[PDB]
Amino acid sequence: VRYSLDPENPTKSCKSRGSNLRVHFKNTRETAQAIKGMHIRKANKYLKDVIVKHQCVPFRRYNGGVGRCAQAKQHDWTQGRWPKKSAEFLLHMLKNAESNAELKGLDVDSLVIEHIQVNKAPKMRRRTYRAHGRINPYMSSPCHIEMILTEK
Amino acid sequence: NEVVTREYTINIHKRIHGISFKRRAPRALKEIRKFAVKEMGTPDVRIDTRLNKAVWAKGVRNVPYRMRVRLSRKRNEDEDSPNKLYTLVTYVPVTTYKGLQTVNVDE
Amino acid sequence: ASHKTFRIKRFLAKKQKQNRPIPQWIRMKTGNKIRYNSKRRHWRRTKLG
Amino acid sequence: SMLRLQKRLASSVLRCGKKKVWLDPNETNEIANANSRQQIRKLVKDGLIIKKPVTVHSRARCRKN
RNA sequence: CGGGCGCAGAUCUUGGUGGUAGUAGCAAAUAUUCAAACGAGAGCUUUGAAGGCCGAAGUGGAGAAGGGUUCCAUGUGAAC
Ligand SMILES: [Mg+2]
Ligand SMILES: [Mg+2]
Ligand SMILES: [Mg+2]
Ligand SMILES: [Mg+2]
Ligand SMILES: [Mg+2]
């Protein structure tokens, strides 16, 4: 509902949305930037390899403290991790977008991820217990995810 | 053929060398499972419970130095799993390990 | 404690019957004005005194 | 399923600890239908629930010493 | 004509949001492992087997004070 970057041709495009998803926003934004411009089948093979840690997700922006890996050189980057949580939620949304292209009547084998963004959702409220009788906020960072897939 | 069964001698002593006392027996089964994947080129290794008793026979830290093991590659026959085959790993009680070669068994 | 007075047990009986959530048909009555029972207490996080 | 009610009911029927209650792994679906002490007693009479024997604490060495 | 009439500051008030930061951290009391079951989903549930610990000044079995339904069965798996 009210996507950003409305498609160039809405007839050859399928959309998928997700709100209040309990993935980490920083881990998901880096995962979403990895699958952008990939085919629907290449994005699935890439995300399925991140879960089994066969290729990494390069952490470009939120890279403070993340470690280095040998798989990061594939992306001309030094830092990379394997956000299994972010790979599964994005894999569940690619499955929904592929099923939306079927209901619309699109060639699913020709889909390419045109637009994909991850917003910040309202943070969830939990608390941790610190020293000297203090309570600090233990806040979740959920995310809104949307994506546009087009034919090529 | 596809369905095959051989007997191996896993030198567990050199695979758990340098492991803490509380992890020598759990690491041995992870090395036995890795051994079955390496030799029998099939994931989804199923370790017989009698073999779990054999590795844990002398506690968590005193693992037997070697283990006579029979690797039986079978078909899953369910088609619910992606792996068509699986390696059923059993225990072979032997009196001595001297001269035990890798041999195939009959069906 | 197992040893209770009749006044304490009668007091705990009232609080035990108020710790019930609102009926579902209440939200259809007041136009979703009362969304939940804001007086729900848990036996750990809030004591009775 | 979760055989926690049957593990508890059998320990009170057999008058043993929960560490001595043996539930048949092959008949886990049959024991799961037992929701009362009377049905547990029937499973014991059928041999599906047995009291495991006490771990041996032989006094042979001390009696030898 | 009448004002509770103009803010950047007051370790201002209230509310909201950042960088730090996917960071510190989730390191006291020896221990888990195999298989199976249910299940969309299992290192963590259950069952069995194995190997361990508490070792009767128990990590055991029952009370007092205090708690007040936390007891028990079933269901759910949003939130915690
Ligand atoms: Mg305090
Ligand atoms: Mg308290
Ligand atoms: Mg003023
Ligand atoms: Mg101001
Ligand atoms: Mg009740």
UniProtKB/Swiss-Prot annotation, chain D:
For this protein, what is any one GO molecular function term? structural constituent of ribosome
State whether keyword Calcium applies: no
Query: What is one process in the GO biological process aspect for this record?
Result: translation
Protein localization:
Cytoplasm
Q: Give the CC-aspect GO terms.
A: cytosolic large ribosomal subunit
Q: Sorted alphabetically, which keywords does the UniProt record give?
A: Cytoplasm, Ribonucleoprotein, Ribosomal protein
Q: Does the keyword Cell inner membrane apply?
A: no
The UniProt entry's sequence similarity note says:
Belongs to the eukaryotic ribosomal protein eL19 family.
Q: What does this protein do?
A: Component of the large ribosomal subunit. The ribosome is a large ribonucleoprotein complex responsible for the synthesis of proteins in the cell.
| Quaternary data | Component of the large ribosomal subunit.
Query: What name appears for this protein in its UniProt entry?
Result: Large ribosomal subunit protein eL19
Fragment boundaries within the full protein? 2 to 66 of 196
